[PDB]
Structures are given as structure tokens and as C-alpha cells.
Design a protein around this ligand. Structure first.
Ligand SMILES: [Fe+3]
Ligand SMILES: [Fe+3]
Ligand SMILES: [Fe+3]
Ligand SMILES: [Fe+3]
Lengths: 270, 270, 272, 272
């Protein structure tokens, strides 16, 4: 694949998306536009298919009936030019090989690393920007609405949310909508309080692989509730949420030990 | 030029923008991305330069001292597959002159618009004739003057394009000459004191030469905030090309499609 | 709806590049791997590209001619209507090109491809032809040759010749089997391909893969073809080609008929 | 910052298409108009592309051959460092390639282009060379030939040979002036180009325009070059080339020196 022209054609297109990220500090990419990029990176058509089913095997906690999830820590390592699964750092809800060995999921990680690489952003004082590594915390999350966070940043450098599917979800333009604000919006606000003068744009995932990427230090955001289409049945929404930041600055530090039982490491560049 | 590869490469890119227009019902294209498109269509570098000066020769009416403008009516004719200057329809001293309409970057902008809007299915205004193979494009070259209002609306047409040519002493704060895009449920006539954030789709702000917003006028509402002066002691100006494109009035005042006898102009669309 | 498809214009852009190379070099060879995305961009379906590898199985067989099976048809590149159309037979005829070929969208893309390139290219004018016309005659042969256990250096007497490879059977590729040589105008008309002078050789080409395509200016190059050589000498070897002979009509001052075909009609736009 | 430039990756994507054609055909010929955007995409500046047409004016000149002016240098494709570097001279010498050429970003792009294509291409292994190595020796000649009012069919003894045209003066072209013929392995070593057999001819090319480039697998082709012909017979004719001879090191079972050049250091990445 290091010799495959479609690989480099895909990188060219991703470099164009990266220029737009630089300029706007966020991008929304339609899932139909992500598919050829991910294929070019090495995703198989069977793994794109399997991506739409992996959310069925997320962990169910009875103390959290409105969400099912798995999560894992990855490292974008720009010395080795690769991304690898890291050991658990504070367990039955770890991301499994089913997701992390999926080549389309791996393509998504490569996609994000390629875009965020080299992009100058606001530096959070608690983080170490002289490092050559990033920590990416990935959540595979199914939310469940049975018949509320306000405006915020996630405390990282780059956030990516990729839609995998949903069930009984209304697309009524107020359902699971991500609002994007400039920094002058009040970090507490709900929708009764958000000011139009501070709203940049409004996005809604609806189709497989719809992807939103945002500079978390330079936007604030909020996400409206999932609305059920058939109000009598449950609605679910399946997402991959990637939280990527530089390591914690030393004088609680991040462990960069690879995972022992669930190892994984894909090249970033070929 | 019908033989020039860069012409078809430009069309291919325009067709990608056209797909995004179909999906989102508007597009914003940065000036740096417009330039190679206009070149591929036939714009010379000298005419791109001259486009930044043509707004100095606009008509000045003492009746309105905050606007200097010229205007002209054009026809996108899809049976002759060309666009032509139409005669004046209500002597008149603020007609667009050859300085603009024979400029090849201006001509490229007309071709750009026609190619994107061609074939795009939209909401039909009852007072207009959508079985026609001709469109009326009313073009204003407009300099606004802020020497030391309209509210949320549609323009009454099918497609509106606003392209930035330049400005002087313009503040680039997040509220200076910003175009707000609203869904249809925003109240017509509302000013920014009452626009609801639930109904705000996007906001854009022209900033650089050839920044271009294109929108389906029957399926968005919009508003344009005032130009703010950087140095508050001096006047601020903003130079735009505003294209108002619609099907002709249904006959059942008719539009005249007689060509301009004194200022003819006709460029192929293809 | 292809008129709005970005890949249509991307294909045209690449075809315009090939056209510039044709103007410069007076011939071009395009590998089939490079032709496939161009034809797709023009409207060829992958089913029709597949079916193009079978149409040569239905060519006409005459006992008069045991080493060749063939069908042919006359087409018109009409640059007033900006389309290409099937013309009537011009001399009971049983070896006419059929809808199986001429309605194949990959074959149609091949015609559009050629018209797009040759359009506007200034060439040497044959005195017997009329270059004021807006119409070209394209005589197309679908030809299977058979070698079982010929012509020298020549021109075809037209303006542009295109030869596109569809397939073969038991053909030895490593040898100089079915090699097209092109020569400058000082090569001896009629010379056998073994006797051609290297000093007069302008190009050497060999179709080997599906949709390998040679296009040449027939008035400014001479050419010659070497025999098909069988890989296994004990068996027959076959080679399937589309051969497009395109020229301006004969000058009034026998004429070409431009009547469209009444029973096998066909017309597609050159530009969408 | 070119590592973030989309046109860099677009160039590479086209280079990899050429590489597949090279694998299939065991040679490729790239017209200069097609090379220019590739070299630009790799990092060639347009000023350096202009200056490449002048560097052959400063080649070394010796009375032993009044028909040849040249400079040369050894480079190493190092696929462990993923870089190409200038190596020290290995046999007092005054015809060394200078910084004028080797720091030219278009020349550097030509080196990158070659390593990118040849990398990983499986070829016939010369017994005298070491194909377990991760380094290649590239001997580059910048060469101006002079014709004023020899070698036959051969191999160069390397793995891959590239010839890029920089310019010419008073060169005839209608004739077979400075035509490169390629032959299969059954053509007779030492044959004069006038006496090669068409049945063993695998291609014929002729550099004509700035950056026309021929790459060939030297172990699986033979080749020959015809003399430069002057357009005006009463004047001298010149032809300016870059000739890249690339091979695996000599098997240690004279050894190639991989010490870097100390007066004329140069090292550029093959991949950004
Ligand atoms: Fe958040
Ligand atoms: Fe308006
Ligand atoms: Fe012939
Ligand atoms: Fe040689």
C-alpha cells in the first residue's frame, strides 16, 4: 500500500481538509466523503460494514442505563510515526480487538493524526507541547433515550466525533445537534441562554461516518438531546468520540506503556 | 480554451461545489480557492487585478450617500448556452459599464454561478415561471459607506451570490458585516435583537478578495450586520458584487429579454 | 445526469492532455489501464466493459476468408449536431456491426474519446477529401484474426486511425508478435516489416492488454504490423481489435452517403 | 512544510502510477511536460528548473575528447536513512559535479523521482552485486556531446538507467537524431544501430524537449543510441543530458565506498 496510488490520492484530499481545519478551526465531513478517504488509507469494505455493528457489544452498566460504552487510550507517536494502544490507566469496558483491529477504525485514527499533525493551536498551561506524542482517549458510545451538559470545552486539544448509526432518531433539526460557539459564550449556558451573536455554526450527524473535528481550545460546544421519532420507543445513537491532547505536564502524568493483553500499533505514515 | 485541460479541471471542482450546494442549500468559497477556478474559466490575472479597482467608478447619488452602486440585468440562457447583457428595464446613469462586464474575472464569476445553479431543484416561487430555459440575473456592484437595518429576509429570487471585492478601514470583529443564515422558521423582519439561536444555521463573514457566498434564496433566510469601522474616526467602505438570480415572472410585469443595444455582452456558458 | 458529474470533467481534462501530446507527436499510445478510467468517466458501464471482451465471439465468418472474422459499420462524427451516429450501409449484407457492439456504452465511449481528441487537430490535407465539411466518416471494423498451424508499409488513406485491443488467445507476447511499427514518410511503401530501416522508425508499439489503444495521424505516418505469433505452436492464435478509420468526406469536385441507418439506428452526443 | 502540501501527495500518486507501468513494461518514457508538475510537486522551484537549462554550460572540457564535456558524481540511495546523499570521489580530479547542479532543487527532485519508482521493483539480479543491501550506488553524469562538421547495442552493467534531456542546440529532429532503441536480450551485443533487427526491437524513443526522461531496467533490456544529427550541417550540434546509472553495491564475496563527500556534502530526504 506504500506503493498504491489511491493511498496518496487520499492523503492529498486529507491535506486539503487540513488546510480548511487550519482556517476555520473545525471541519464537518460527510460520511459519503469519508468512505473513499478511509478506503485509500486501508479500510476494507467488510470492516466498514462491521463498523456499523460493533456498538452492539458495548458494556452495560446498570448504574448508567442511558449509555453503553467501551473506551481505550491510544498514543499518536510522532517519533515512531505510528499510533498504538496504551495500557489501561484509571475493568470490563475496555475497547476490544473487534473495534481496534477493524481497519476502518484504524483508518479513522490515521485520518485524525494526519490532520492534527503540525497544526498550531492554543496551548493549555497544564499540558506539555514539547512532546512528540499525543494521548487519544477514544469512546465508542451508544446513548439511550427512554420514553444535559451545557456549553463547554472537553479539556483537550482536538475532539473528533464520528457517527456510526442510530435507531428511532428524529432528524428534526433540534435532535442531537452540535452547536459551535466562539470563546465569548458562557461556559454554563443551556439553550435558553445561548446568544446568537456567539454561535458560529450548527452541525448534525445523520449518516454513517459523518465526522466533526474541532480545535477544543478555540471553540466551545454543546450537544442537544437525541429526540425519538416514534415517541413510544427508545432511541439510540452510536458514536466514536476521540479526545486528543498533549501529555500532562510534569512538575498526574500519563502512562505511555503499550497494552499487554490488547496490543495494537498501525503506521501513521507508510 | 475549449481544448485547455485546466478549463475542465476547473469545471470538475465547480461540480463538487455544486454537489455541496445541493446538500447544504448554501456554500461559502474562500477567495484563495476561487482564484484558480476563475483562471481555469478564462479570467486573466490583469482582470483579477482590475476587479479590485472597478468599485472606484460606481455612481454617486446625493439621494443616498451611504451607497455607491451600478447595476445591470443579465440572462442565463440555457438554449443558447450563454449569458448576455439585457437592455435596461425600469434616462439612467448607474448602468454597469464595459469596465466590469467585459472584465474576464467578472465574466468567470457569472459562468461559475450559472454552472452551479444549472439543474438544481429548489422550491418554486408561485409568481415565477420554472418551465423557462432562461434566468434573469440582476447584478449590483455596490460600495457601502459608513460615515463616522433590513432584518431577516429573503431577496425574492431563487439563488443569491455575494462576492467580496475589497474594503477600507473595516473592523474584522465577529459582528462586522457578518451574513447570518437562518432556517425558514426564523421570523421575517427580525433584527439581531430577536433572532433565535434555535433557527441559526451558519454565519459567514467575507474578508478576502473573492470570498463568495451562494445561497438558495427560497430555502434560507438571511441578514447582514452593519460594517463596523476599525478606526472609528474615518469612513469605512465595503465593495461587493451581488447577483440576484431567478426564473422570469409568470405571464398568466413581464421581464424583457431584449439584449442591450448600447452595451452588448455575451459569453458562452460552455 | 453525467453532465453534472465531476469525474466526467476530470476525464475530459485528461483527454485534452492526451490531445496535446497527439498534436506534438502525431500519434499516442494509451495503455488499457489508463483508458479504463477515461471511458468510465465518459459513461461506460463496468458491465459493458466486460461485455466488450465477448462481442468479438459473434463476428461474421466467410469461407472466402478463413483467417479473419469481422463486422463493420460506418459512423459519422457530426460537429454541427455535436454527436456521432450510425450511417446506412454503402457499397445483401450480413457482416454489419450489430446493436451488441454499437449500443455498448464502452464502445460508445471509445467513439466519443476519438472525436474529442481529433477535433480541431490540424493535419495534412488529402487532395481527394473535403476539409470544409463539418462531418467525418468513421469506418469501424471489429476484427478477429486467426493464425493456424501480408501487407507492408502503408497508409490507410484516411486522416486518423485508431486501433483498440479487445483480447487475444494463445498469442506469444514476448516475441515481436502483432507489433505496430510507425515510420516517417521516407520509408518505402510496401516494404516488408523485416526490411524496414531503423533510421526511418518513429515508433514501435504492441497491444497486449484490454483497451490498449494506438491513435495515429494517417497522413503523416506510415505504419506496418507484424504477424501474430502463437505461444503454443500446436494451436490457433486469435487477436480481437476495434479498428477506427476516420476521414473527411470525399470531395464532390464516388461520394459518401450520410443517410443514417434505418434499421440499426444509433446516435450519442459527443459533448454532454 | 511541503509535507503538508496536497500537491506533494498528488505528485507521488502519479509517480506510483508510472511505477506500476514500469513494473509492467520494464521501461517508461515520460514527456517533459508531464515531468514538470511532478518535479514541482516534489519541491522543485521554477527558478531552479530554469537554471537546469544552463548548468551544462559549466561542464569540464578536455582535449583528449573534443566531442565530450561532462561532470560526474556518485550518490547513494540509502533506504535506511530514507535519503539520498553525495558520496566521496572514488577511482586528482576536476570534473566533479558541483553544488550548482547537486543543490539545484529540480535535480534533487529527479533523484527523488527515480528512487521512488525503482524502490521495491523486483528485477533480475546480477551475480556480481549485493541485493541484500539497503543502499544503492547512483553514478550520475551531466554530459554535453558535441557534433562538428560509436557504441553499439549494450547493457550499462547496472540495475536501472535513467536519461533526462536538459537541452540541445542545432539538433535535427525529423531524422533519427539521437534516438534511443531498446532491444530484447536476443539482440546482438555490439550491433551497430543501423543493423538491429526489427523483430528484437522493444521500443524507440527520442528525447526532444526539456525533461524528457527514459527509465529502463538495465538487466532486462539492451539499448543503443544513434548519433546526434545537426540541423544545419555547417554548424556544431550539442545535446545536454543527465544520465543516472543505479545499481546495488558490488558483492563483497573493488568494493564501493559509501563515505560521504566532505567538500561537496549533499543529503536530501526521499520522503518528507
Ligand atoms: Fe464535549
Ligand atoms: Fe438579502
Ligand atoms: Fe493500416
Ligand atoms: Fe547505455
Amino acid at each position: 500500500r506504500v506503493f498504491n496510488p489511491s493511498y496518496y490520492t487520499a492523503i492529498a484530499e486529507i491535506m486539503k481538509l487540513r488546510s480548511k481545519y487550519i482556517t476555520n478551526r473545525s471541519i464537518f465531513v460527510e460520511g459519503s466523503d469519508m468512505v473513499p478517504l478511509l478506503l485509500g488509507l486501508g479500510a476494507t469494505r467488510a470492516d466498514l460494514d462491521a463498523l456499523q455493528r460493533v456498538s452492539n457489544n458495548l458494556y452495560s452498566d446498570p448504574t448508567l442505563p442511558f449509555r453503553r460504552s467501551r473506551n481505550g487510550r491510544f498514543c499518536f507517536d510522532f517519533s515512531t510515526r505510528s499510533v498504538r494502544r496504551l495500557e489501561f490507566q484509571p475493568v470490563f469496558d475496555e475497547v476490544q480487538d473487534e473495534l481496534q483491529l477493524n481497519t476502518a477504525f484504524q483508518a479513522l485514527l490515521v485520518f485524525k493524526g494526519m490532520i492534527c499533525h503540525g497544526v498550531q493551536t492554543t496551548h493549555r498551561p497544564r499540558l506539555d507541547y514539547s512532546s512528540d506524542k499525543w494521548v487519544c482517549t477514544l469512546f465508542n458510545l451508544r446513548t439511550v433515550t427512554t420514553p444535559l451538559e451545557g456549553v463547554h470545552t472537553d479539556g483537550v486539544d482536538h475532539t473528533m466525533t464520528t457517527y456510526l448509526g442510530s435507531k428511532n432518531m428524529d432528524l428534526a433539526a433540534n435532535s442531537a445537534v452540535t452547536f459551535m460557539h466562539d470563546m465569548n459564550e458562557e461556559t454554563g449556558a443551556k439553550y435558553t441562554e445561548i446568544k446568537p451573536q456567539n454561535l458560529r455554526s450548527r452541525v448534525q450527524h445523520r449518516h454513517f461516518l459523518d465526522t466533526l473535528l474541532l480545535v477544543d481550545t478555540e471553540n466551545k460546544h454543546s450537544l442537544s438531546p437525541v429526540l425519538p421519532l416514534d415517541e413510544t420507543k427508545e432511541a439510540t445513537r452510536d458514536m466514536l468520540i476521540f479526545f486528543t491532547r498533549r501529555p500532562v505536564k510534569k512538575g498526574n502524568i500519563d502512562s505511555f506503556r503499550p497494552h499487554e493483553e490488547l496490543p495494537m500499533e498501525v503506521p501513521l505514515f507508510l
